[PDB]
Structure formats: C-alpha cells, structure tokens
Ligand binder design. Structure first.
Ligand SMILES: [Cu+2]
Length: 101
C-alpha cells in the first residue's frame, strides 16, 4: 500500500527557460527548483539524477514519463523570482522508488 497522508507522487516537470518544478508530496503543490538554478534536462540519466537531488531520501532508482499532461500556473523563469504568467502544460516525469533486493 501507499501513504494516504501524502497527497501526491514524486515527479518532476520541465519547461526550457524556466526552473524545474517538482511535486511537494506533502501538499500536492508544485515547488520550484530547490537551488533555484536548474532548468530542463535532455537525457533520461540527467532526469534520474535530478529526481535523486530533489527527493534525496526516497531512494529513487528510475524515471518514466507520466500519462497525463499537467498545467502549471505562474512558472518560475529565473532566480526563484519573476514567475507570474499564463499557464503552461507539460508531461511530467515520475520519479520511481525501487525495491532493493
Ligand atoms: Cu508561455
């Protein structure tokens, strides 16, 4: 079973020119890049590394594209500032937790 007390699954969302977003599993909201500097990544390995960076304690071992597109409002385009605009939608990547054997 999963944790009902956590509104969402770990995921990252990218849109080149803007800061990467990730899902806050506690509240179900998209949070901006923790360092406030990282934008889109073009390799699967780079995405996995990023999942591991923003979810350091989740033991993320793989990533896969999500099935549904998602809209994110007022996306952060730099710093952790300058982020009030029209909606954009992207297909997120799910950060998958492996079961270690
Ligand atoms: Cu736009």
């Amino acid at each position: 079973d999963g944790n009902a007390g956590l509104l969402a699954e770990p995921q990252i969302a990218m849109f080149c020119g803007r800061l990467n977003m990730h899902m806050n599993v506690q509240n179900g909201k998209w949070d901006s890049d923790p360092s406030g500097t990282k934008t889109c990544i073009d390799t699967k390995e780079g995405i996995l590394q990023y999942c591991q960076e923003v979810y350091p304690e989740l033991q993320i071992t793989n990533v896969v594209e999500a099935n549904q597109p998602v809209t994110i409002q007022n996306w952060c385009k730099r710093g952790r500032k300058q982020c009030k605009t029209h909606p954009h939608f992207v297909i997120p990547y799910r950060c998958l937790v492996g079961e270690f054997v």
